[PDB]
Design a protein around this ligand. Structure first.
Ligand SMILES: CCCCCCCC/C=C\CCCCCCCC(=O)O[C@H](COC(=O)CCCCCCCCCCCCCCC)COP(=O)(O)OC[C@H](O)CO
Ligand SMILES: CC(C)CCC[C@@H](C)[C@H]1CC[C@H]2[C@@H]3CC=C4C[C@@H](OC(=O)CCC(=O)O)CC[C@]4(C)[C@H]3CC[C@]12C
Ligand SMILES: COc1cccc([C@@H](C)NCCCc2ccccc2Cl)c1
Ligand SMILES: [Ca+2]
Ligand SMILES: [Ca+2]
Lengths: 313, 51, 51
């Protein structure tokens, strides 16, 4: 409490007025309250300075616990499918579905499910720099493999000219070029935020240039659109147990998730912003997995009598 | 009608799950806004999937 | 702005201290910042109240 002036009375005759919210005072008979420095806020009694609350999406908060659980479940499912194919490296289905690119695709799915975990915890500089490029590169790898598996894409590509690895290299390399230009020109970095609420601190990543992120997202969406278009063109062919139909389904799921992303990102305020990111990632990744592999898994492990070249038609 | 029912329900679930952070971290007009969007999205999905 | 005590000087000598947030002081030579009623808040100049 500070001293206020009673008008018309001497200085010895004063009044006691409580300090405002933000400034404190400990010494008795104080004239004016003392401003409290940065990274510090005043308690209710306005007697001392307590530390501000540093908050962010954490590993121990229940929401983060659920996110981690689902990410780990996805990683486990991907590892299971990859092991199933590796053990059956000579059965007709695995031979027909070009096991090399299947291994690469499952590797990139592992990378996506793993990159889903960089959005949890206190953001540092390396974390912020790795967040977007990691998912971009991994998902471009996945979409490139899917696009190669799609019919008439390879013939068109060779007409415009293994060649499939050349295609995946070109796509991933263009994405890596974008990421390198981004990280060289204006890299992102962590940022502490105090103007949202005056009492708490938000550590949020600050993306260096929004143009590079726009390029990244646009290129990923463009590849997805091309893959969806070709799969829709070849959507009735019953080859590989109607593989093109499920490619189409995976692309539809991708687009649905990343269109729902925009309102969810816009309306979210605070730490849970990063939350939304993770959720979107997970959904897309999961869709891919299912639409490309679970059917094949079901035909191989259970009821394995259809594992014959004839039905692979 | 299997893949149409499936996709309508998928749209429903994705729309209502992507908005959980917003509902947990927003007050005022925006939260109501979120509700409307979710509603509309679900409805449209249903229609666009079924008819 | 209100008047703040300079310790060791008579009442005539004081300092000008800006009112805190949500508090107004319309009159010159005010010895106490005034609280806006409910549904009102201080201005950018901390002079009057805006609903
Ligand atoms: C923010 C996102 C949150 C949401 C989380 C979801 C993220 C994951 C997305 C997708 C995974 C799989 C989706 C694949 C959808 C594809 C399913 C589909 O369209 O298949 C139709 C029929 O299939 C069928 O039996 C259909 C069977 C339906 C099974 C799909 C259920 C998906 C459950 C997943 C829920 C987990 C949520 C967890 C959230 C905590 C096609 O048949 P058709 O007519 O051509 O003729 C064939 C007929 O056999 C010949 O007459
Ligand atoms: C783990 C969560 C977050 C999402 C991952 C998806 C899973 C829930 C799995 C379990 C059941 C799976 C489904 C089980 C059976 C089928 C039947 C299959 O049916 C067909 O349309 C093919 C034709 C035929 O089967 O005769 C299509 C894939 C699908 C929907 C599978 C897709 C992936 C699903 C939904
Ligand atoms: C859609 O394909 C993608 C390609 C790269 C990244 C991603 C995801 C993981 N983050 C979106 C980035 C979200 C965003 C948008 C505007 C401003 C800031 C931010 Cl942070 C998706
Ligand atoms: Ca007197
Ligand atoms: Ca004196």
């Amino acid at each position: 409490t500070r001293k206020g002036i009673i008008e018309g009375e001497p200085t010895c005759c004063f009044e006691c007025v409580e300090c405002p919210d933000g400034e404190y005072s400990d010494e008795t008979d104080a004239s004016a309250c003392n401003k409290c420095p940065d990274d510090f806020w005043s308690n209710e009694n306005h007697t001392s300075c307590i530390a501000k609350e540093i908050e962010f999406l954490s590993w121990t908060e229940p929401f983060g616990i659920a996110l981690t659980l689902f990410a780990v479940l996805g990683i486990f499912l991907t590892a299971f499918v990859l092991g199933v194919f590796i053990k059956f490296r000579n059965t007709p289905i695995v031979k027909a579905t070009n096991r090399e690119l299947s291994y690469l695709l499952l590797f990139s799915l592992l990378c996506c499910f793993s990159s889903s975990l960089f959005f949890i915890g206190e953001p540092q500089d390396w974390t912020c720099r790795l967040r977007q490029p990691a998912f971009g590169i991994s998902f471009v790898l996945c979409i490139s493999c899917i696009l190669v598996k799609t019919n008439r894409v390879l013939l068109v590509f060779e007409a415009k000219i293994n060649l499939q690895f050349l295609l995946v290299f070109l796509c991933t390399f263009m994405q890596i070029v974008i990421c390198v230009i981004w990280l060289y020109t204006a890299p992102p970095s962590s940022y502490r935020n105090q103007e949202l609420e005056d009492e708490i601190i938000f550590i949020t990543c600050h993306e260096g240039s929004l143009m590079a992120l726009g390029f990244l997202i646009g290129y990923t969406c463009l590849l997805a659109a091309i893959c969806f278009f070709f799969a829709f063109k070849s959507r009735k062919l019953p080859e590989n147990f109607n593989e093109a139909k499920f490619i189409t389904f995976s692309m539809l799921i991708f687009f649905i998730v990343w269109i729902s992303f925009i309102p969810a990102y816009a309306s979210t305020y605070g730490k849970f912003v990063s939350a939304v990111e993770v959720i979107a990632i997970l959904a897309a990744s999961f869709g891919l997995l299912a639409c490309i592999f679970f059917n094949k898994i079901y035909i191989i492990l259970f009821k394995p009598s259809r594992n014959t070249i004839e039905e692979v038609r």
